[PDB]
Amino acid sequence: VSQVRQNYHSDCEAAVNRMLNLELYASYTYSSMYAFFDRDDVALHNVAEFFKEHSHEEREHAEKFMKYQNKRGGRVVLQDIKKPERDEWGNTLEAMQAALQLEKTVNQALLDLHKLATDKVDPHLCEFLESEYLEEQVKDIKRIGDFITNLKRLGLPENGMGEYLFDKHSVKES
Amino acid sequence: VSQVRQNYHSDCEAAVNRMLNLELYASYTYSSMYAFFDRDDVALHNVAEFFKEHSHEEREHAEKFMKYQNKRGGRVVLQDIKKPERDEWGNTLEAMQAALQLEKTVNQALLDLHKLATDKVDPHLCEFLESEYLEEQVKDIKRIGDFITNLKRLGLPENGMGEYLFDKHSVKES
Amino acid sequence: VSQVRQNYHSDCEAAVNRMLNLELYASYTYSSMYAFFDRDDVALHNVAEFFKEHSHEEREHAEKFMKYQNKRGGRVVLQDIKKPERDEWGNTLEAMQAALQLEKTVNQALLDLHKLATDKVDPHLCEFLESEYLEEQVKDIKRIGDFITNLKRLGLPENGMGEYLFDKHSVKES
Amino acid sequence: VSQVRQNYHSDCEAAVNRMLNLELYASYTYSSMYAFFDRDDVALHNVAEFFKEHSHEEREHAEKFMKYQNKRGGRVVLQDIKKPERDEWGNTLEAMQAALQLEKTVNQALLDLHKLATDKVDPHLCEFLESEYLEEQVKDIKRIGDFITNLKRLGLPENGMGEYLFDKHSVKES
Ligand SMILES: [Cl-]
Ligand SMILES: [Cl-]
Ligand SMILES: [Cl-]
Ligand SMILES: [Cl-]
Ligand SMILES: [Cl-]
Ligand SMILES: [Cl-]
Ligand SMILES: [Cl-]
Ligand SMILES: [Cl-]
Ligand SMILES: [Cl-]
Ligand SMILES: [Cl-]
Ligand SMILES: [Cl-]
Ligand SMILES: [Cl-]
Ligand SMILES: [Cl-]
Ligand SMILES: [Cl-]
Ligand SMILES: [Cl-]
Ligand SMILES: [Cl-]
Ligand SMILES: [Cl-]
Ligand SMILES: [Cl-]
Ligand SMILES: [Mg+2]
Ligand SMILES: [Mg+2]
Ligand SMILES: [Mg+2]
Ligand SMILES: [Mg+2]
Ligand SMILES: [Mg+2]
Ligand SMILES: [Mg+2]
Ligand SMILES: [Mg+2]
Ligand SMILES: [Mg+2]
Ligand SMILES: [Mg+2]
Ligand SMILES: [Mg+2]
Ligand SMILES: [Mg+2]
Ligand SMILES: [Mg+2]
Ligand SMILES: [Mg+2]
Ligand SMILES: [Mg+2]
Ligand SMILES: [Mg+2]
Ligand SMILES: [Mg+2]
Ligand SMILES: [Mg+2]
Ligand SMILES: [Mg+2]
Ligand SMILES: [Mg+2]
Ligand SMILES: [Mg+2]
Ligand SMILES: [Mg+2]
Ligand SMILES: [Mg+2]
Ligand SMILES: [Mg+2]
Ligand SMILES: [Mg+2]
Ligand SMILES: [Mg+2]
Ligand SMILES: [Mg+2]
Ligand SMILES: [Mg+2]
Ligand SMILES: [Mg+2]
Ligand SMILES: [Mg+2]
Ligand SMILES: [Mg+2]
Ligand SMILES: [Mg+2]
Ligand SMILES: [Mg+2]
Ligand SMILES: [Mg+2]
Ligand SMILES: [Mg+2]
């Protein structure tokens, strides 16, 4: 094994590789949402930029898992990054509903990895998840939920004026 | 078709989607090289950062193709991003040889897309490739070739001292 | 012929004069839209200013063709600038639909001139069009398409509140 | 007991005193390495300064355990600080190998203390270790491993030129 390796279970190493792939998958899905909202027949540019930023966020979190793996003496093993589940995302409400589901999926994977790290008595991995991932995840889930509530308030999917207003007021001006 | 579409052939639209995927593939391969040189048993951190920067460069070029597609009224269609061809990259010389091959592969795809755009009489696509991709590609191929020449000069793969010196002097200090 | 003339076909010279006139025509049409949206019974001042700016843009592009003609040793020949096709433009959606058509007409003329310059083996004229006109044209077509999508979303032509909001949020505050 | 004491087991208090001593021991060993590399017949001054800095780091961590003990209402009990295991450290590679072992020893003691704090249901002690010690420990182990890899690459112990270069490029200039 690696000269640096200490208290790092093979199962945790493998689960870290899986989490890395999941973050890349999430990044790619957000990229797809960006592209959709940038379409001339969709044209909600602040919404598009929101998803672009989230894509970048998830790619950064993937890189953090790569660095983590190497710090512990594990070995990064990459797999294909699967394309997103949809080619088109309907409208701002449908996209935000998909983003909520995606964030909860990622959160469940994080929680499952914490269970594993607990079972293998790895407090370094536990604290890494607790301090670098779990809180920012809850914050993102909360924000997207807040958005969904507002999109429904604004009359989505039927109310185009409401959708237009959301893009101007709820997401940062790009 | 899209209200903005004008003089944009279906074949070109499809080839732009393929080029987008290839850029993402190249980005992912460079990411893998970063991770390798960050390993505790490799530990060439300036080399690692060089590949990290190139990974980011290729992802930016992918995003540029997405924006291009939408500007012309084509539709972004994403496919899986295939994992890199190797899980480990040997040493700085082997990695740079792989990078050279990768850059030439990307360059050939760009040149092939220019042939297609020429055949379909699409000067906007021709100029986009000429002015945004073809020159920066030749510059990257030249830089990597220069590096390979120096790595051979330095006695790679056998000369570890040479490899150490390359990391200190040939690539930016990170 | 002119002492500076080299590789400049008579057909290209004439087509450059025609393109100059078309740019002036486009400028004048945009001027008409400005005047319409400035009317007390229309009164969408940010929309008006958008069209004013585009009028100025097209006049600048006409001047660029004049300078081009002289640089190559051709001779500027002016014709009447025809009045716009309409005296009144309905509403923001109808005007933007007309602007889209106008931009596509100008784009087709540019593409046709590029075909001619290609046929006459004039790479200087080709590059001038490619680098100074074709990309900014695609960008304007994309922007107007995006606007039309949003105007429809906002319920135009019937929804006056939507039209009011477009003027406040989609176009620069004047 | 102390008026401030709450949820602090005697076993944890004692283990904190032992950890304090271990940090002082580690500090003293690093001090010895500094002195060795400062010798006129060794004379690798950047390496020496690296070890001096680590000596200071470990003494600071000892002081942090003293403060911790008092914050919880435990009582600092000091023992002799044992001299280092060697009087001379061979060369940069041998010293770094010893430092790696020392850092792993300290890390194991930290992990063992976390197990104890877990068994005694002391989340304050758990979080103190997690947030103030465990991550910086993994970072130091990684850095020293990276160094060892480079020293081997440079031909240590036989290659004096390699050793000279390491002192100039791998450790901060003092
Ligand atoms: Cl282990
Ligand atoms: Cl294991
Ligand atoms: Cl779909
Ligand atoms: Cl914390
Ligand atoms: Cl408002
Ligand atoms: Cl406002
Ligand atoms: Cl078309
Ligand atoms: Cl077609
Ligand atoms: Cl491999
Ligand atoms: Cl040197
Ligand atoms: Cl130097
Ligand atoms: Cl001529
Ligand atoms: Cl002629
Ligand atoms: Cl009329
Ligand atoms: Cl150019
Ligand atoms: Cl107590
Ligand atoms: Cl007790
Ligand atoms: Cl000794
Ligand atoms: Mg080994
Ligand atoms: Mg394993
Ligand atoms: Mg599939
Ligand atoms: Mg815990
Ligand atoms: Mg926190
Ligand atoms: Mg976040
Ligand atoms: Mg997230
Ligand atoms: Mg997250
Ligand atoms: Mg349509
Ligand atoms: Mg098609
Ligand atoms: Mg495969
Ligand atoms: Mg040709
Ligand atoms: Mg050019
Ligand atoms: Mg150039
Ligand atoms: Mg480049
Ligand atoms: Mg490249
Ligand atoms: Mg390139
Ligand atoms: Mg004369
Ligand atoms: Mg003539
Ligand atoms: Mg008439
Ligand atoms: Mg060109
Ligand atoms: Mg350009
Ligand atoms: Mg323009
Ligand atoms: Mg225009
Ligand atoms: Mg134009
Ligand atoms: Mg008392
Ligand atoms: Mg006691
Ligand atoms: Mg003794
Ligand atoms: Mg527990
Ligand atoms: Mg914490
Ligand atoms: Mg922390
Ligand atoms: Mg430290
Ligand atoms: Mg330490
Ligand atoms: Mg430490």
Side-chain angles (χ1 to χ4, degrees), chain A residues 12 32 35 40 42 53-54 96 141 159:
Chain A
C12 293
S32 179
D40 78 87
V42 182
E53 287 173 354
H54 278 271
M96 288 293 176
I141 290 165
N159 199 317

Side-chain angles (χ1 to χ4, degrees), chain A residues 43-90:
Chain A
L44 294 160
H45 291 299
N46 296 327
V47 175
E49 291 289 330
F50 171 86
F51 290 123
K52 183 189 176 160
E53 287 173 354
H54 278 271
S55 181
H56 288 3
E57 177 174 341
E58 301 312 290
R59 183 51 152 92
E60 288 176 342
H61 289 7
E63 292 166 27
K64 189 175 312 188
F65 277 118
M66 287 187 284
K67 192 78 161 161
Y68 186 88
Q69 187 73 284
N70 278 338
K71 277 162 78 168
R72 293 298 303 276
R75 294 288 167 253
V76 174
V77 179
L78 302 177
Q79 301 297 342
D80 295 348
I81 306 164
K82 294 294 195 179
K83 72 181 188 175
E85 216 81 88
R86 293 173 63 171
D87 294 320
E88 68 84 30
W89 298 99

Side-chain angles (χ1 to χ4, degrees), chain C residues 12-149:
Chain C
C12 293
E13 178 180 356
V16 165
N17 285 330
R18 290 191 301 273
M19 199 67 228
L20 191 172
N21 185 264
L22 181 58
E23 289 286 3
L24 292 170
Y25 175 84
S27 177
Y28 201 22
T29 286
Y30 281 132
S31 199
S32 179
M33 296 181 184
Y34 153 74
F36 178 75
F37 289 98
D38 185 66
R39 287 167 57 158
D40 78 87
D41 57 2
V42 182
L44 294 160
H45 291 299
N46 296 327
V47 175
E49 291 289 330
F50 171 86
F51 290 123
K52 183 189 176 160
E53 287 173 354
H54 278 271
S55 181
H56 288 3
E57 177 174 341
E58 301 312 290
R59 183 51 152 92
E60 288 176 342
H61 289 7
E63 292 166 27
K64 189 175 312 188
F65 277 118
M66 287 187 284
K67 192 78 161 161
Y68 186 88
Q69 187 73 284
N70 278 338
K71 277 162 78 168
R72 293 298 303 276
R75 294 288 167 253
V76 174
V77 179
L78 302 177
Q79 301 297 342
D80 295 348
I81 306 164
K82 294 294 195 179
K83 72 181 188 175
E85 216 81 88
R86 293 173 63 171
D87 294 320
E88 68 84 30
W89 298 99
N91 57 62
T92 308
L93 175 59
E94 289 193 22
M96 288 293 176
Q97 289 166 326
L100 179 64
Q101 183 173 350
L102 178 63
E103 295 288 331
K104 292 183 104 184
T105 294
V106 172
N107 198 34
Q108 191 60 61
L110 292 162
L111 289 170
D112 289 350
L113 182 47
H114 192 286
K115 289 180 210 171
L116 176 63
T118 295
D119 178 67
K120 300 304 192 190
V121 198
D122 189 335
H124 183 274
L125 180 50
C126 285
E127 172 67 0
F128 176 65
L129 297 170
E130 283 161 28
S131 69
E132 298 293 330
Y133 291 84
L134 296 184
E135 163 58 359
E136 71 85 22
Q137 204 65 22
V138 154
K139 286 177 62 59
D140 283 319
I141 290 165
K142 178 58 166 63
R143 184 110 170 104
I144 295 163
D146 290 354
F147 283 167
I148 291 162
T149 294

